[PDB]
Symmetry: D2
Subunit: 294 residues, 4 copies
């Protein structure tokens, strides 16, 4: 391995081009993003065989300073004319490889920094503020992009993934976990009605990478919509396990978005202990990792 | 000082008596709490001169185990018939001092563990779920109560305070900070239009402690309403400083809620640096502490 | 309440004047600090009736910018000729009140950012490096100072306190907790031999505040010595409770340091659950608070 | 992907068999581990085609409860007769695959929970305590193991890696970063003498995975020794970049330990800003990733 880069490149932009013209689904009222306030946390990694001597000899001649990568990202958020974090990453990646010919590969991660609307009274009525926003520490959208320079100096995207991270959902009833193996290592009682509490990280990949950019917004899959599918399916389902639940969420996602190739889940179990009153469990947490494919 | 107790006593209760019959204000649509899911994090501290030898001699005869305090709190959440965290603390405090005659003082802190509603499609339409909730890591209500046993075994509340913690608000324009002292220690440029980003912790005290319990809900002051006042005032105000803003929020709170005696602010400045694009500042943060009284 | 200021003012200084000539005690090898690297996290709070209109009118005329306070602290670390965090706080406080006549009160907290020595080899001989240090996230020294301007314009230290924070000690055997109250709320079994795990925060006050500055190092009480006293007493004692333990630690501190007036403890219980193998408990933690006086 | 398991399985064992007979090197005083206290944080992931219906049909028949996996790990720590985290992972993995024939693959991560020795005095003499230990939140050893069941029912380790995580080192002088690319995105000044502050995560792989277990202790590579090599090389080197430094650390490690096949570095740059006094930078951090092979 041989890479270097910059992490935690925060950048906040006001009045990005709004996202509109999206295609709706029954589970979600989502109809676009105002983009009055747009924040992203970017990580950039770069590689290339010409970087070897920066390690083996301490030769910095071909080293783009990581501070300069930070400047690069922040400047490009100012000039970005698109509507999605996915499109922003492509803009940065393409621009970076065009600028720095000795770099052979670039990886980017972008995490939304979410803000929520607030309300204010003005001119006699209470309404959504166009000025004041609440920083949210709950779920957030993510995007990943990897781009390579080929021998002929053409650029190719080699991997793209979008996601939703930090979703924490508890369903107070209508969940069971029974029928599991009962042997000499088992002390967990069967439970026909538990308040299942899951952490969900959901990632999806498009059949066609272009659909991720938002340039034809009707083909874009919004994290907001994925969130609403997850909550609806959780509500609808008499769950038999977390495994059972996330398969069903995945199937619904792929049904609602035929342009997707696959969905990947990372879930954690944080269900409370019963002492109706419950309390926090000991630290160990179950987890599940599962891919659903078209 | 001589106290001991238990912290991080999480307790989650389903179907607490709903809070309704509240008195509305223009800034807030708040009309009550469903209490399908009610979570609280309690810290309990107890004192009394009869605890001395548990320190000086290692004599545990009069020691209520802190583990037993945790059991006490969780059991009382199960039996609580009221509608507010403030009332829960009074219930716990009175009960504890009645049980344990050698304890002279008890302090309680209760922090709301907030959950947000989610949507689900059932029977043809999308509607708020009565089963699935989203755990929120954003702002949360707080309550504080101290109670003492007098010589005649009567119990008195000696301090009560309610609050709202973890409110993080950014206003993208309509904020200035100019005219401050410019001397040999000053490098901060004057700024006629900054995206002021404040953390707010707001605490209020009632003229009549009975009003905090929710037994006559029309006299209760809800953290939700306080939150909505803060966002409204922030929006309305061409801020001149954080100091200026929190005084105005305080004045409005006291105007809307004549039954309050005072409001106390702890604010922090987390305003982004301009590189329109902004980024995270260095770690040092400004803060302000201010009390507004009727 | 009416204060404002700056928190998380990190400042790192190289080659501070070394602390030397400290009176040693049996429990500790500590004799001083080389101060090749000296890190502090400072919080400054200031008050004064002349600050009122900065809140009530948005008048910034007598506002020292919190950014400027940060500059003030960092510039004074560069000029500081003393040898302790306690002395540094006094230097900053006195200087600030001398500079800004409209300020009546200043409160300072200083937390050590600790660094540990590392090994390097020269001529086949391994010894402590004078260049490379390890940043520690374990225990750290603290200092507190409050200074006020009197009506006759004299300056007075109204409160001073030193401390040790973040000490986490586990004793694998030789600890009991038995004989506590057993009633309807008690589920905790008696334990004649538990691996007591305590978090300790220890704070001391001097009879004479001048002794805290270290200008006469024979009278200075180092956090390192307090640490070594705590571990020695823990080792020596068949503990009967945390309450029992911290009283004995306090007595030993006051015996070793007659120049101290009091020692104040804040302890927490994080003892593992037994399944010899143990595991982490549920989140609730016991705590104790106790002052021992000379 | 199709896996599930348990994370944050903390387990603390007293009086594990001591690690003895480790070959000492000039950079380090390390000669073994007393293992009076032995703490590990384990993550277990398992897979197999037969787990499919637990996802697709909600069939729990072949589900080992994640709670049971926790029980399995903790019971095996109790019976483990070896001397290393690496060996413990092998013990758990082999045991688990022997028990559960429907499981085709198991991945294990083990992270040391480190404790440090403390001092105690008896009859006027200070020595290391055999009873009281200090929990450390600084650097810690890691181990990774992946094991699979083949078609002929033999078991095979497919991946093994050891490591040192959480090392934070600052060298106060003797570091430069100059000669990097200066173009339209470069604002970083060259620095001929910076107080380079690096976070290091170092991982190594053995030529023979058997050497990782410690059964032949002369071939075991201790994380403590890797730490002391890293600090020695940092001290000795006039660093030209972090890239330059980690290459040299890697080369020294492979020189000292011919039984190793590779060393992999993940570093981060956290160097302070100069205001001699320095302060914390803005959040963005540089990072470097490099593999040195034998
Ligand atoms: O949904 C669940 N899946 C599991 O694998 C499991 N194991 N314990 N509890 C569990 N719950
Ligand atoms: O609102 C503000 N108040 C202050 O006191 C201050 N100081 N620097 N910036 C500031 N902003
Ligand atoms: O040392 C202890 N003190 C206490 O007060 C306590 N309560 N539960 N366990 C305890 N241990
Ligand atoms: O050691 C460094 N490597 C880098 O790549 C770099 N970029 N900015 N500063 C840096 N320092
Ligand atoms: Cl689970
Ligand atoms: Cl400020
Ligand atoms: Cl306790
Ligand atoms: Cl860097």
């Amino acid at each position: 391995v041989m890479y270097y880069g910059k992490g935690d490149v925060f950048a906040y932009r006001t009045y990005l081009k709004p996202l509109t013209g999206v295609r709706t689904i029954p589970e979600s009222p989502f109809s676009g993003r105002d983009h009055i306030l747009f924040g992203v946390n970017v990580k950039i990694s770069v590689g290339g065989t010409k970087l070897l001597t920066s390690f083996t000899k301490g030769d910095n001649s071909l080293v783009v300073a990581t501070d300069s990568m930070k400047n690069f990202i922040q400047k490009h958020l100012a000039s970005y004319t698109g509507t999605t974090i996915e499109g922003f990453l492509e803009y940065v990646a393409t621009s970076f490889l065009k600028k720095y010919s000795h770099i052979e590969k670039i990886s980017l991660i972008g995490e939304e920094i979410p803000f929520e609307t607030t309300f204010a009274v003005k001119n006699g009525n209470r309404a959504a503020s166009e000025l004041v926003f609440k920083k949210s520490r709950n779920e957030y959208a993510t995007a990943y992009l990897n781009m390579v320079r080929n021998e002929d100096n053409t650029l190719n995207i080699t991997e793209q993934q979008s996601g939703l991270a930090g979703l924490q959902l508890i369903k107070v009833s209508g969940n069971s976990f029974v029928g599991f193996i009962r042997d000499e290592y088992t002390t967990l009682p069967e439970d026909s009605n538990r308040p299942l509490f899951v952490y969900l990280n959901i990632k999806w990949k498009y059949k066609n990478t272009e659909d991720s950019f938002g340039t034809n917004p009707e083909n874009y899959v919004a994290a907001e919509q994925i969130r609403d599918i997850a909550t609806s399916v959780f509500h609808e389902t008499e769950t038999l396990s977390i495994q059972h639940l996330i398969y069903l969420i995945g199937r619904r996602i792929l049904e609602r978005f035929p342009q997707l190739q696959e969905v990947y889940f990372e879930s954690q179990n944080h269900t409370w202990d019963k002492i109706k009153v419950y309390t926090e469990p000991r630290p160990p947490y179950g987890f599940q990792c599962f891919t659903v494919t078209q």
